[PDB]
Amino acid sequence: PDGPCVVSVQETEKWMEEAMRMAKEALENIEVPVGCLMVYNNEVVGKGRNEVNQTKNATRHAEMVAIDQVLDWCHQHGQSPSTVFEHTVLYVTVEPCIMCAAALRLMKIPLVVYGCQNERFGGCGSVLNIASADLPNTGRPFQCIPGYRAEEAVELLKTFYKQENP
Amino acid sequence: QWQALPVLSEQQSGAVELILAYAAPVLDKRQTSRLLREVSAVYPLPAQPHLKRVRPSRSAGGAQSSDLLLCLAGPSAGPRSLAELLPRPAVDPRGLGTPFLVPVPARPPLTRSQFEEARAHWPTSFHGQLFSTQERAAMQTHMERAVCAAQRAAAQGLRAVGAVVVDPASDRVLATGHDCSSVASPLLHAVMVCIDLVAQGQGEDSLPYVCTGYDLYVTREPCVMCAMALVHARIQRVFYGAPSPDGALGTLFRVHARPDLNHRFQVFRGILEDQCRQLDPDP
Ligand SMILES: [Zn+2]
Ligand SMILES: [Zn+2]
């Protein structure tokens, strides 16, 4: 078993309650309400919410922001990215899209805790299962812990699309 | 001397679809050699080279006639006379009868299972050409530009993968980029770099779907991360040289041709392929 994964998994309630707070942050900022944390050894290493409309760029999903924050946190502390990502647990409101699933594979993340399903674009099962897929040249497959506080997380999407065009 | 071959949906790739065409019977079978010359010159049917142009008939009894494949049918497929369809004196039509409509298969059959299925509506051969020959030079100098960029990358010690983003309205190069993946920054594939270039070059009021309308030329086929990015960004067309082993626009996925994503776009493969075969693959 990974040592920094089991330690990070323990305060899962704590990391989600902040992951949710970040989705409420993105909601009231007219963003798709997804927020995530990346925990390396019971310490937040990158955070991130959806920044799509803000940057006028659509690749800036929450998960892709955080990956950049953790590559920074690697660079300031001069640690190689391989030895940090491979022991990092990602906490995200919503099953990662088909794109972010591929990034996490390439970063060799090992584990993801998500809330509610992702019917529109989900790459963890819903549309394609990129996470467990056999992609020999696209990083390392990773496993998922679905469902954590999904009801709260989905009532955030429902109240984003009946609000985008009534 | 390269061809650009569309990559179509999982479903749409294995079916035989038909289009309406006008044929006409040959009554004077000795004008056949002649009428073939005179007609397939006016209407050469470039989009459809798989279609033998004379269909033999047999009568229960053994009466051998033929019908000549004339031309494609207009959007209002009513009956059309010989004079309407065959201009003179390009075509001395004598020897032909009144023209009828006939379903003929729209695309060259790829498997033998489609071939026997197409043949049943109109004869066809086994074992097309899509663009103008000035647009074929448009894509020429753009793929070249992406190979020129790909090689720059390998020379420095980077994934030999290059990409340009062209606005087809003006054939203006909007972004040139190659893979920039480093140990500190592993997600800078050529395609991801080109998007972030595009996005920073746009005014205050701009949609976040930063690729709408634009073309993309990549040396080899995008990975999953890249391909989906082009979906979220709403690219219009994508031309690549050779496939990639984990490619998401042909090889292991076709994310451009799905109902489930909010967006769908054309993918062509083979542009300047012989060059790109030796470039590196995404990722
Ligand atoms: Zn995503
Ligand atoms: Zn890629």
Numbering used by the authors:
A (entry chain A): 11 to 176
B (entry chain B): 25 to 151, 162 to 237, 270 to 349
Any passages from the paper?
The eukaryotic wobble adenosine-to-inosine modification is catalysed by the ADAT (ADAT2/ADAT3) complex that modifies up to eight tRNAs, requiring a full tRNA for activity. Our structure and associated enzymatic and biophysical analyses reveal that while ADAT2 active site catalyses the deamination reaction, ADAT3 active site is inactivated by the replacement by a valine of the glutamate involved in proton shuttling during catalysis but also by the capping of its zinc-binding pocket and the loss of tRNA recognition determinants. Our results show that the ADAT3 N-terminal domain adopts a fold that shares similarity with the ferredoxin-like domains (FLD) of other tRNA-modifying enzymes, yet with an additional specific structural subdomain, containing V128, which forms a loose interface between ADAT3 N- and C-terminal domains. ADAT3 N-terminal domain is essential for tRNA binding and deamination by ADAT and can rotate with respect to the catalytic domain formed by ADAT2 and the ADAT3 C-terminal domain, without affecting the structure of this latter catalytic domain.
The ADAT2/ADAT3-Δloop mutant complex could easily be produced and purified using the same experimental procedure developed for the wild-type (WT) complex, including the ion exchange chromatography step to remove the bound nucleic acids, and further crystallized. Two crystal forms were obtained, diffracting up to 2.1 and 3.0 Å, respectively. Crystals of ADAT2/ADAT3 that diffracted up to 3.0 Å resolution were obtained using a crystallization condition containing 0.1 M HEPES pH 7.0, 7% PEG 8000 and 8% ethylene glycol. Structure determination was made by collecting MAD data on ADAT zinc ions on the crystal form diffracting to 3.0 Å resolution. The combined MAD and model phases were then used to build the ADAT3 N-terminal domain. Surprisingly, the ADAT3-N domain is positioned differently in both structures with respect to the catalytic domain. Specifically, while the very N-terminus of ADAT3 interacts similarly with ADAT3-C in both structures, we observe a rotation of the ADAT3-N domains by around 90° with respect to each other. This rotation is only due to the movement of residues 34–39, the rest of ADAT3-N superposing very well, and possibly of residues 152–160 that are not seen in the electron density. Inspection of the location of the positively charged surfaces of ADAT3-N with respect to the tRNA revealed that these surfaces are completely opposite to the tRNA in the low resolution ADAT structure.
